[PDB]
C-alpha cells in the first residue's frame with residue numbers, strides 16, 4: 241500500500257499520465273485498453289474517463305482487490321474489468337487490444353521494472369497498428385562533485401570511534417544509491433546512453449553497452465556518476481508529454497541513481513570525459529569504466 | 540551494510556554505549572564479555588579497550604565476516620573472538636561469561652528486536668552474579684495533534700485526481716508509521732506503559748497490557764498516539780547513562796512509532812485521557828483502546 245500511495249502523490253508521474261490521456265482522448269475513444277500492472281487502477285480510470293470502450297487492468301499483487309473496490313466506488317465496473325495474476329498467465333476476455341498503457345519503470349529505468357511484462361503484452365496482445373505508452377524512454381548519465389558526501393560514505397570508515405574499519409569501503413562502493421541530488425553538485429552536461437521505443441524494443445535490447453562522453457562544466461573533483469531517465473508520450477499525440485527524473489527537474493519518487501567512485505579524480509571545465517557503461521540482467525548490474533578503472537554496481 | 544553504517548552514525552546510540560563502557564571500566568576490566576548480535580564488532584572493541592580479558596562476539600549475519608577483518612585491522616584478535624550463527628546454536632569456548640552487552644532494540648523497542656536472544660544468552664550463559672547491559676528499558680506513549688498530516692494520510696483518499704479511493708483508508712490505519720515527530724505537535728505528557736529489567740525479565744513478559752492516562756497539555760484535535768522508548772545503563776555504574784528515543788530528544792535511527800487514529804477526537808488541556816494498550820507476539824502487534832474504539836496496529 242505504501243508504494244502505491246507514494247506513487248499517487250508523485251505529481252510529476254501521475255499528472256503526466258493524466259495529461260497524456262486527458263489531452264489526447266482520440267487515442268482512447270472507443271478503444272480496448274490494457275493497463276499492465278494497474279495497481280490501484282488509476283490509469284484505467286483515466287482511460288475510461290477519456291472514453292475507452294473497455295479497459296482491462298492486470299496486476300499480480302493483492303492491491304488488485306482494492307482496485308476492484310475502487311472501480312466500484314467510481315461506478316466504472318461496466319467499462320473496467322480487473323484480472324489478478326501475471327500478464328504471462330492470465331486469461332483475457334479478448335484476443336487483442338488497441339492500446340497498452342503502463343507505469344512499469346524502476347530506479348534507473350530498469351532496476352526491478354515491469355518492462356518485460358509490457359513487452360510480453362505487446363507481442364502477445366497488441367493489435368496490428370495498435371500503440372504502447374509511454375512509447376519512448378531514455379537513460380542519461382551526468383558527472384557529480386561532492387567531496388563532503390564522498391567523505392561521509394568512504395573516508396568515514398577509516399576512523400569509527402577510534403577504530404579502523406577501512407575494509408567496509410569495499411562493501412559500500414558496489415551499492416548504487418537512490419537519492420535526490422543537489423543540482424549544484426552536477427559538473428557536466430548529461431549524456432544519453434540508451435533510447436528505447438517500446439514499439440520496436442525486445443527483451444534482449446535491455447542489456448546494452450554504450451560509450452559516453454561527459455562534457456565537463458566545472459573544474460572540480462569528480463566523486464560519482466549519476467543516472468536518470470526521461471519518459472515520453474509521443475505517438476499520434478496532439479499534446480505530447482515528457483517528464484525527466486533528472487536532478488535539474490522537480491523530484492520524483494524515482495529520485496536519481498548514484499554510482500560512487502572509489503577513487504575521486506580531478507576534471508577541468510571544457511574537458512570531454514570519456515567512459516563506457518554496460519547494463520546486464522542476471523538483479524540488474526551496471527558496469528562502469530572511467531579514468532582507467534572499472535566497477536560493477538548493483539541495487 | 541546499510542543498517543550497520545546507519546547505526547554507527549547514530550551518535551546518541553553509539554556514544555551512549557561508548558560512554559557507558561569507557562566511563563565504567565570496572566565493569567569490564569579482566570572480565571569475560573558476550574556481545575550478542577555484534578554486527579561490525581564496535582561494542583566488542585569498546586569492551587576490549589576498557590580492559591576485557593576476553594570478548595565473544597556472536598552474529599548470524601554475514602556482517603560477521605567484515606567484523607573478523609575489522610578486529611584484525613585493530614589488532615584485537617587475541618582479545619576478541621567472533622563466532623557466526625544464532626546464540627541458540629553456536630558453540631562458545633567457555634561455559635559462562637561475566638557480562639553481556641547488546642544493541643538489540645527494534646522500533647517501539649520490541650518490533651523485530653533481538654531481546655529473545657539476549658534473554659536466552661542470559662539464562663544459558665550469564666554467570667551467577669553477572670550483568671546484562673543495557674539493564675533497564677521503558678516504553679512510553681504520548682498524544683499527538685496533527686490535522687494536516689492526518690488529512691495527508693486519510694482524507695487524501697476521498698478524492699485522488701477526481702476519483703474516490705475511500706476504501707484505502709482501512710489499509711492505511713493499521714500500519715504503524717516510523718518517523719521523526721515535530722515536538723510542537725505533542726499534546727500530552729508522556730506515560731510509561733512498560734518497564735523491563737533485563738536481569739529479571741522473561742520472554743513471556745514481552746507480551747503485556749497496560750492501562751494508561753495521558754495528561755493532556757493542549758486543547759486540540761488528537762489525531763495519533765506516538766510511542767518511544769528509553770534505555771538505561773544503571774547496575775554497578777558510577778557513571779550512569781540514559782538515552783531517550785522520544786520526540787523531545789535528539790533524533791535516533793529508531794525515530795518514533797506513530798499509531799494513527801481513524802477518527803480524530805477533541806481533547807482539552809488538563810484532561811486525563813485514559814486508554815489501554817496491549818502488545819502481542821504472533822510480527823508483534825499493538826492493540827489500542829481509546830475514546831471508545833479499538834484498533835490493532837502492526838509494523
Ligand SMILES: NCC1(CCNC(=O)Nc2ccc3cnccc3c2)CCCCC1
Nearest residue numbers: 384386389390393417463464498541544545
Ligand atoms: N541510505 C542512507 C545512506 C546515505 C546514502 N547517500 C549517499 O551515499 N549519497 C551520495 C550522494 C552524492 C554523492 C556524490 N559523490 C560522492 C558520494 C555521494 C553520496 C546513509 C546511511 C547508510 C546507507 C546510505
Ligand SMILES: NCC1(CCNC(=O)Nc2ccc3cnccc3c2)CCCCC1
Nearest residue numbers: 242245246683685688689692716762763797
Ligand atoms: N512512508 C512515507 C509516508 C508518510 C508516513 N508519515 C506519516 O503518516 N506520518 C504522520 C505523523 C504524524 C501524524 C499525526 N497525526 C496523524 C497522522 C500522522 C502521520 C508517505 C508515503 C506512503 C507511506 C507513508
Ligand SMILES: [Cl-]
Nearest residue numbers: 382430486488
Ligand atoms: Cl542533468
Ligand SMILES: [Cl-]
Nearest residue numbers: 681729785787
Ligand atoms: Cl514526550
